[PDB]
Amino acid sequence: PPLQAVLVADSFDRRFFPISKDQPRVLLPLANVALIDYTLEFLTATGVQETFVFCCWKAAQIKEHLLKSKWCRPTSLNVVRIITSELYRSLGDVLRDVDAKALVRSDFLLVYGDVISNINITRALEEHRLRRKLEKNVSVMTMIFKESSPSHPTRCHEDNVVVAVDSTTNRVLHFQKTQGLRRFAFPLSLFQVEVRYDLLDCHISICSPQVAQLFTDNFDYQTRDDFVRGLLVNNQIHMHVTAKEYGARVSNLHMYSAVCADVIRRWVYPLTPEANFTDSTTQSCTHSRHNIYRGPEVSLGHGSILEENVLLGSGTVIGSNCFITNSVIGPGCHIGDNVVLDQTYLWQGVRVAAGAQIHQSLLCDNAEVKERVTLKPRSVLTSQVVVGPNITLPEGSVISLHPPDAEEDEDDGEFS
Amino acid sequence: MEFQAVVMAIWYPLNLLEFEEVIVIVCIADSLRYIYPKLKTDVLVLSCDLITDVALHEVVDLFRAYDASLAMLMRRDFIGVDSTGKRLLFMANEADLDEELVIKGSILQKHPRIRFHTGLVDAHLYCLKKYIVDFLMESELIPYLVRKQFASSQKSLDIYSFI
Amino acid sequence: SELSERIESFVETLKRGGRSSEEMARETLGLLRQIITDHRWSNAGELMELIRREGRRMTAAQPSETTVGNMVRRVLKIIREEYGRLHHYAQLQSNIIEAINELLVELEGTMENIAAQALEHIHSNEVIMTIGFSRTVEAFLKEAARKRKFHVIVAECAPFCQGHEMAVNLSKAGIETTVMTDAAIFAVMSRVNKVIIGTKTILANGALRAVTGTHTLALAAKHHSTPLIVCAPMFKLSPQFPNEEDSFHKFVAPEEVLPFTEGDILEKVSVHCPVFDYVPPELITLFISNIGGNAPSYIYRLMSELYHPDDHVL
Amino acid sequence: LFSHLPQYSSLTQFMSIPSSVIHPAMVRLGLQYSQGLVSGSNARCIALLRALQQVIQDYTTLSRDLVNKLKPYMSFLTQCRPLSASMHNAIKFLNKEITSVGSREEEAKSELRAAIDRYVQEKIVLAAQAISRFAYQKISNGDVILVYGCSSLVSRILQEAWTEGRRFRVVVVDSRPWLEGRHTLRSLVHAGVPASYLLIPAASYVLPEVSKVLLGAHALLANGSVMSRVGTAQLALVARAHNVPVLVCCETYKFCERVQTDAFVSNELDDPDDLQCKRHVALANWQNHASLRLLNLVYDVTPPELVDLVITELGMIPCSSVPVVLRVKS
Amino acid sequence: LFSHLPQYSLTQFMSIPSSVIHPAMVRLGLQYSQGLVSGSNARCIALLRALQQVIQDYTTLSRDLVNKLKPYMSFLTQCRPLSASMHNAIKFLNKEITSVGSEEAKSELRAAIDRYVQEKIVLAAQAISRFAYQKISNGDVILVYGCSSLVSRILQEAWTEGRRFRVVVVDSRPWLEGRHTLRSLVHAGVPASYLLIPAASYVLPEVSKVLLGAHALLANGSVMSRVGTAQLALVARAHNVPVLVCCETYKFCERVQTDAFVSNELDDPDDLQCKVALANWQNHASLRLLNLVYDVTPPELVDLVITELGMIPCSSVPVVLRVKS
């Protein structure tokens, strides 16, 4: 049968709270292409033909960006069927709005909406169908986990989970998020059985339409974690564990940094920045040595050193004697002289004036920084912000045009 | 005399050793403490019963290669073995825990895949290293030694099991 | 249309990587035959612009897969030579088709004509050493194995261990094979009498872009003066010189080299995993083509009678 | 056709479970050799030669008895894993030391096992920190160094050189099936030095940016050839082809008076089953094909023209003084 | 070993007024077998004269003559393995017979042998002589090897057109063939010196250029010729003296070969024992006597090929193989 997918293009948290306020979360560029493009390209590569896209928050931006994208042209073998509805508040009413319209008829494939992966759901889907028909509609989901290692940058402590599985058929007997916990309480009676912590959550559940029924009759569910926890106290959830293919979901901005550094280093190989998988004319790249990508008409300065893992957008004049490295610089922006950019992420259009040392950070689009500015690690600069010529922002400072949301305003620190 | 087999207090134990002496040729859980004046050199505590001629060569090699602090033979008590299938991580003989097999997060970060076996038969073929019988002087030790790692009468001790 | 959707299906298959090289060339010819049939075009100029544009997008899809670019250029040469001998020509649309068919029967016989020259280059009690898994070299070693008896050492290529299925394929045909670890190429080089490899691409100076161990192989072969035979047909002959402007390397996921289960050190270690390795032409001895066994220093002439010099750059 | 070299798959089933003819320490050590818990050329010599200190005080009588008593031990050891020259010269020094002493038994047993710690100090410990002084001045302030696999000395260098403020950039080249360049990569990222890891077939893509190639030796043969891990000779050849200088860090005691003119003498075969990829796997059950053989070399010989330096505990010699340090010592 | 290549020591079976093979072809084959006709040019001239004799005795045409004279070339491949000059001569002859359409065609065929011998074996030799006159200067010394009908012609006409050089003749056992050069030099008045191949590294210090002859130039530039040539050119490069090989166009074979093992006739091993300690070599089971007739030198050991078209760098012999076909 045809394979469908549900793509919840509204993330129902506020993890990017100064950033999700103006730009919706699945439009903010990872490696100069938006987060909804990686999940859509993953869905197309898997074999999905009838993606549905559910948007609640800032649906105008999402739909406007989608129509000027690759998957809304009639060439694409993956229709998008955008469903804009402001009545959504969680994944629960999104996925029980499926049975309000009966969209799915076979086992669909629910990705969350900002999954970034090169997973091939053909072994997992065929295993799910095989144990679907054989044990008479017993299994209702096949969770997709990546075999990670618990001390990894991609395993951020909010999304960290532990499972207890049957290990002879991969069947989730217990599942809990280890957000804050030192010792893990595994209930008994699930033996009459491996226990795994090396599983990245990856949010590529392959849930069969019975799940849309199970969200429907029990209104109290709100998210997939609630559903897996609330079923294992009662049916089945199995899994499939991948080892050779990348999979991640950018939940928080720590995860954003980890997955953006993983994409640049070609861990998501069919979705590298030089592949131009979104086939736009403004995002072509040339992968040079040391994972250095420079877009068309970049005009690098004299004496500037690009060490490694640099992505440069189109129209990205760089000054003289710079030490830009490990960073993503965005479609068209001005970087001045003698700067240092380490693990930074600069979106479309910035003014980095001269000699400014920007370490681990995130400068959103149309940002402004003046001469001799020394942004420290984990500093976030939201859209259209300006930073004056003497600021040294503390480690962990968010700056936006909305003073209630951020810790600053349109200029440098301690001013309005 | 690398090892010294100790037989608790029986032709199947005494001739499973095809060794040259037992502590059942002189006959004199806590009996190993009463057999302490024998030369404490890597005791091999055997069982009174339920021993069925398993080859020692696969068990003792988990004590002469990995330099295990302790090595058992198995053929209500829940054991969590490492992914290699030879390293004990979580022994809990007490099934009377309050319906919660609690696991320390440190072992799950160090050893991610813990494979749990349900009620394996304990052959009581303990390959204690020579300081454990001394450490008792200053089950009862098999579920303590697996917790003592991650008491020191020697490094970090390690305990390996054969199935 | 059916054809247009098949064009972007081919382009996206090229980008993602979802077949052998001869199948790549055969599918490229089928696609280009469809392009010149079903599109409407008045004269040869518009069709050459069309073929050039579609070849540009199929080449920019996967620039390291040059069999599709070579067959685009071969069709362009066929177009401008079947229009030259008629110099809007009505029968031209037929004429190119026949030449394309004569190309498609030039294909599907490339592997037989390379395998026919096996006995002239492989002797009894020989030891041959290969690297990747190329269908051309295994047919070469399986046509020489019908008469003579020899030893073949298949040094596996380390990230994608693909010499494993080569040595499984060769051992089924009775060749006594040895699988190596790719670190031992200089070690077992003293014994090896000939080195027979395959290529992804023969560049225009006789150099070749091949599987990632072949330059480390060719240096050992040149050190011990072992002849490096290269079995590669004429769709693998690309008119591009090894310039620094165009990137010929392909880099795949580092999971092939350093697995994701390493953990925190993956944030500091830069793992690369290239799959192709430049072999300069002075380490090569022969190119066993489908038309003979000529030297590397003849390859430029094979360019001039395959691709027009206006078709080099598309 | 590496037929004259044994190919091994545990030799512990037939031997007596208490102290047999072979010592408890020797069976423990040989089992560790065969399983693979000690792998370094240095670490095997210390592992032998302080498990052998356990032999001496347990032995009760002295020279002629102990020399022929020790031979079954190392016969069992070379049955477990073939002895490298770090072990071979260790045993040669040991036998010379035993035959040197003669005429009290307790004083001799104490003096032997104390002059064996003296061997470790003045030839493996004080040596390795004298190699590092010579190689610290040869490591530039901004260069790129290509290492190969785990070496206890190559990783002592460029970690004792980084902590003296040198700020190079190491590139780690590794090969299957040992994959031991991960062990020199985890322990090198922990030092904080920037690293890069790639497999040995891509030893010619990364070698253009490399400034020098630092390798370790398992033995230096008496014509100057370097016997070490398999990909070292291939690596040095491609290093010469990219004209990058190539250095070998070897202690003096690893100098063997045995000369090999190729790479097919005493180049031990380990388990061929290590070559199974576990991809799916195609080479599994390779014994089912009769014509199919698997070759798993562990050692390889690079000729002295392919290598520039040899950093030794006594100076930096140009690899043709390898027969000469074999003379001025002993 | 050399198992695929044939070992030979053949006219006993055929009737004296032979009908299986032509009389002239029997004479030719037995002269090849005994050694009365040696050298690639001399063998090609003798073959073409015998084929003219065959055609003038032919009475009936295109298919019939080709399948009639294929057994003749089977006989000649039995008697003495055909060199590539003979191979290209036979290929040209078969193409000529197949080209002849629907008595008078015998005279037109027989003159095409004369138009083959003249402008590809004689006129080509004169053109190669004119080209190699340029590379022979006054006072230099030239190391030739063995006997070549073209090398000796080049030297003799270079001497008689005014050069004052000196020749060193390097020779090999068991044919001892450079004596036929040496004597033919002394009649021309050229100063000469004679020595064997092992002494070549003794005189390559004084030699200015090594001028060799080719029995065939292969499709990669390898020079297939007499067995000492490749070794001599290797020592010549090790003493950095230029190596010139003088070959006509018609000897260019499209066969390609890397090592000196694929197509190398073996003469009878009984030539090897010298005046004896080797006469009873058959009774020694382990002892095998091996003498090759040809080997190939790689194109990197040859600095120059002189051809009737011009002087070409030995890497562009497939160029000439293209432009003549």
Author numbering:
A (entry chain I): 41 to 232, 238 to 279, 285 to 466
B (entry chain K): 1 to 9, 36 to 44, 48 to 53, 75 to 78, 87 to 133, 155 to 217, 226 to 237, 240 to 243, ...
C (entry chain D): 9 to 26, 29 to 97, 125 to 351
D (entry chain E): 179 to 187, 191 to 242, 248 to 289, 292 to 467, 470 to 520
E (entry chain F): 179 to 187, 192 to 242, 248 to 289, 294 to 466, 471 to 520
What does the literature reporting this entry say, word for word?
Eukaryotic translation initiation factor 2B (eIF2B) is the decameric guanine nucleotide exchange factor (GEF) for the GTPase eukaryotic translation initiation factor 2 (eIF2). Upon delivery of the initiator Met-tRNAi to the site of translation initiation, bound GTP is hydrolyzed and eIF2 is released from the scanning ribosome. eIF2B catalyzes GDP-GTP exchange on eIF2, enabling rebinding of Met-tRNAi to allow for a new cycle of mRNA translation initiation. Two catalytic subcomplexes, each comprised of a γ and ε subunit, decorate the central regulatory core, which is a heterohexamer composed of two α, β and δ subunits. Curiously, the eIF2B regulatory core is related to an ancient family of homo-hexameric sugar phosphate-metabolizing enzymes, with conservation observed between eIF2Bα/β/δ and the archaeal ribose-1,5-bisphosphate isomerase (RBPI).
Motivated by our biochemical evidence that sugar phosphates are activators of eIF2B, we determined a 2.9 Å cryo-EM structure of eIF2B bound to F6P, the highest affinity identified ligand. The eIF2B-F6P complex shares the same overall architecture as previously reported eIF2B structures. F6P occupies an inter-domain cavity within each eIF2Bα monomer (chains G and H), which is the conserved metabolite binding pocket in the ancestral eIF2Bα/β/δ homologs. This pocket is on the opposite face of the eIF2B holoenzyme from the previously described ISRIB binding pocket that sits at the symmetric eIF2Bβ/δ interface. Protein-ligand interactions in the F6P pocket are mediated by both the sugar and phosphate moieties. G196, A129, Y130, E198, and N208 form H-bonds with the F6P pyranose ring, while the positively charged residues R132 and K234 coordinate the phosphate group. The 1′ position of F6P is exposed to solvent, suggesting a way by which bulkier ribonucleotides (e.g. UMP and AMP) could be accommodated in this site. Notably, we did not observe electron density for any ligands within the eIF2Bβ or eIF2Bδ metabolite pockets, despite their homology to eIF2Bα. The holoenzyme structures in the absence and presence of F6P are also strikingly similar, with global r.m.s.d. = 1.6 Å. The most prominent difference is a uniform shift in the position of both eIF2Bε subunits, wherein the β-sheet rich domain moves inwards towards the cognate eIF2Bα subunit by ~1.5–2 Å.
